[PDB]
Amino acid sequence: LKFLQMALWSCTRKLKAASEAPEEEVSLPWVHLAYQRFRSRLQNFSRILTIYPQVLHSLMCEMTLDAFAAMACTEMLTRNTLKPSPQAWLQLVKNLSMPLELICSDEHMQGSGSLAQAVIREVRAQWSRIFSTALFVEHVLLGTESRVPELQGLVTEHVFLLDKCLRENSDVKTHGPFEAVMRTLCECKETASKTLSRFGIQPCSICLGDAKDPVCLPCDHVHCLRCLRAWFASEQMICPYCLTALPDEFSPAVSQAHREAIEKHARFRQMCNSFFVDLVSTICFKDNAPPEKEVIESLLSLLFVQEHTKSLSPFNDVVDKTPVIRSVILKLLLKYSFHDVKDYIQEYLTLLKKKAFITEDKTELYMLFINCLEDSILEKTSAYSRNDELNHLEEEGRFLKAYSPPANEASVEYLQEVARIR
Amino acid sequence: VISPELEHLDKTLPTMNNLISQDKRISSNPVAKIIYGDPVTFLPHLPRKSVVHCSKIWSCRKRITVEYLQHIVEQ
Amino acid sequence: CNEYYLKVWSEWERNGTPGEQRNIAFNRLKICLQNQEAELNLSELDLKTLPDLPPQITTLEIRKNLLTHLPDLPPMLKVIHAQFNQLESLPALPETLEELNAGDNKIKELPFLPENLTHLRVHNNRLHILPLLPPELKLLVVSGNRLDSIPPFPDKLEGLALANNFIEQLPELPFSMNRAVLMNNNLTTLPESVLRLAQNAFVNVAGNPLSGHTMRTLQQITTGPDYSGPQIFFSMG
Ligand SMILES: [Zn+2]
Ligand SMILES: [Zn+2]
């Protein structure tokens, strides 16, 4: 109640300071005006104190208690990382996300002073770090507990490594932090592979994927049953990878150990991919501004191996046999204004369309882009009000009036026009 | 009894549409040719140069709603 | 000098970290001293680095350890099986080395090799640069590395394997070659000498982005069984 008094008192003082007149006297009406003007901020501060009452102990003409409460929470979450228990910590982070994300938005805190702005800048870097570590925890750690409990220690260590690498500059929309996260996740997957088997995990030299139907040999390198049958036809007794003379009487079979190990490594890869995808979607592609050129270029590079296509993942260990095309990165880029993303999307199209992944009769490929562009517009329009809808319909009318029309191909501007017309 | 049938709509409907469109009562109608067939065959004014001037890029599409999500989730 | 050997083996024993069964190494190494053994073993001891090795042995097993770099070497260390260590690169190699296996390591490049090194295996390494090969290299194995390059093949390369690298172009296989494996490389084409070989050599070239018309070229050639060249395969399910 003391803190709420201080907050509403500062709001009243500020509002009266802007009264077009001095603060000769501060009457009761101004208090109601303050509540009306700062209702949401005060409710949010109350929500924060309710969720994590401990913040009060840390707290011991401008409204700033909310920003300092947020800073205290980010401190009393970076310090208590994974404590008391991973689930409680993750759940607290989740509960606080909504109020902390509100405080970190320019809309909620319009016009606050410079101390509040600097505090919010730090609270933003802190929240980015906390949220990234929390997503790593939720996807890799919790899953690892149930599926592959043997790795929980390594995942726990890498959590603090991630927190340590993101600390100084946590703007994952820039290049350095993005590469640092990708590098850390790659080291973690590599170490897990070395751990789950002292000879590691390698794909079969025939299929170069995971050794489905795993078959080991006196050389300890792994292959597949079906590939070994196809290889053993005749005159082909020796392994391909090492040229070892197999005993004439040899007969292959499956080792349960390796199939379990492979399944564990696949579950781990799946969790790490989910973490990367969530970090890109939520943290990287968040602002009202696209990430920098280097991040987008790296992401577009990750889709393809040196061509073959794969799902969005920093690991060059899974590949789609046929060149599949998917819409994720396109939807993410289209979250922003087309004017900014045109060159990225046209580079993506020219890259796919470079006989790397498609051959001819591309009418289906263009439809993919058009559909996403259509979705993008619909996504934006659903935010509009009734008068915004009328002004939109008039603008679109004068656009249809202004529209006027190379061959043998299409560009993202032509496809965006086709979508808008549709 | 009903549920077995709905599973096969994606095929059964194009079949019915074909049988209907090719019926004499329809197969000579231009609106039907536009809806079910490719109009380029019978409209010479239609361009045929740019990939954008195909038939499918200018075809309808499913509007996404909450009901359609509900149905997909249940399936 | 035996006392200095005893000192260095017991002191490197003093480096006993977790998992490193260097005590067992001490029984074996002292035994090697006592017999002046021709054969010695240190494999599977999870070791990470080694002290000076006995000089009079002609064989040394160090496989499945965690070694990353090696100490002084015998004069007559003919046969090393160093499969699956963490080696990055190896010291000066001995003269009479007639077989060496360094597969599953992390090596990037090796030095000069003997005249009679009839067998070499570095599968699953990270090699990037290959020096010249001997006249009697009955076997060359480089798969698992990151090579799109290869020096010419020696006169005596009977067995060859090259798969899982990035090879785009291959020198010619001599008449002595009898079993070539070139799977999932980045080869552009397989040259004509590969046909002139005997009618019994297996050549797998599947997984490569080979020239489709070059494929059809081999198609016309293979539909003519009148030639007694080897059997060439380009893909299997
Ligand atoms: Zn296979
Ligand atoms: Zn083998």
Numbering used by the authors:
A (entry chain A): 3784 to 3843, 3854 to 4099, 4112 to 4210, 4217 to 4233
B (entry chain A): 4684 to 4758
C (entry chain B): 37 to 273
From the reporting publication:
We recently discovered that the initial step of ubiquitin coat formation on cytosol-exposed Salmonella enterica serovar Typhimurium (Salmonella Typhimurium) is catalyzed by the E3 ligase RNF213, which ubiquitylates bacterial lipopolysaccharide (LPS) in the first example of ubiquitylation targeting a nonproteinaceous substrate. These adaptations include the IpaH effector proteins, a family of bacterial E3 ubiquitin ligases that are secreted into the cytosol of infected cells, where they engage the host ubiquitin–proteasome system. IpaH proteins comprise a short unstructured N terminus, a leucine-rich repeat (LRR) mediating substrate recognition, and a C-terminal so-called ‘novel E3 ligase’ (NEL) domain. Lastly, to gain molecular insights into the interaction between IpaH1.4/2.5 and RNF213, we determined the structures of human RNF213 bound to IpaH1.4/2.5 using cryo-EM.
The cryo-EM maps show that the LRR domains of IpaH1.4/2.5 interact with the RING domain of RNF213, whereas the unstructured N termini and the catalytic NEL domains of IpaH1.4/2.5 remain unresolved. Binding is mediated by the canonical concave substrate-binding side of the LRR, involving an extensive interaction interface spanning from strand β2 to β7.
